Design a protein around this ligand. Structure first.
Ligand code: HEM
Length: 153
């Protein structure tokens, strides 16, 4: 579990993300798609996009980034009590979207890179450590639901 002090490091930096959800969501998805091109192939909506410049120009991608970060924020703010929020997400990601757990690890790494670029002063090693723990918790709970339903392990 995270301590109360580690949750406070997480949510302090997240309040800052909430100043510009759309810009954050962009940088994260672009970083994901460039670092791990195979992830872009999951998105019928985005697979036509070939360059970073086309990505940065897509309003629909920016819209999806807000969808993603809003759902994540609602989970973080539950500070681990996130069962009701996380269940619907794991079901759709397992059964509809077919998203490997490994891809959730990839987007976690994208999230941490972008927070580090945008908020150095609020995102030192101790906050980075806390955020890494929160994302691990998120992945571990999703992984449990996947296993239940019989999805890739
Ligand atoms: C932090 C992780 C993520 C969160 C919070 C998240 C959240 C969401 C939300 C809320 C939706 C819309 C409702 C639904 O279908 O459940 C969505 C859709 C989707 N997500 Fe995720 N997602 C995450 C990670 C990923 C990753 C890593 C991928 C793929 C590599 C992925 C692929 C998709 C696809 C294909 C859709 C549907 C897009 C469309 O409308 O066609 N998601 N996600």
């Amino acid at each position: 579990v995270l301590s109360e002090g580690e949750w406070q490091l997480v949510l302090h930096v997240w309040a800052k993300v909430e100043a510009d959800v759309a810009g954050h969501g962009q940088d994260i998805l672009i970083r994901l798609f460039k670092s791990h091109p195979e992830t872009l192939e999951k998105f019928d909506r985005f697979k036509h996009l070939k360059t970073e410049a086309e990505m940065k120009a897509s309003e629909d991608l920016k819209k999806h980034g807000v969808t993603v970060l809003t759902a994540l924020g609602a989970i973080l703010k539950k500070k681990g009590h996130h069962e009701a929020e996380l269940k619907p997400l794991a079901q759709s990601h397992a059964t509809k979207h077919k998203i490997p757990i490994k891809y959730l690890e990839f987007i976690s790494e994208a999230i941490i890179h972008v927070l580090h670029s945008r908020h150095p002063g609020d995102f030192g090693a101790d906050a980075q450590g806390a955020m890494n723990k929160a994302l691990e918790l998120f992945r571990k709970d999703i992984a449990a639901k996947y296993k239940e339903l019989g999805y890739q392990g």
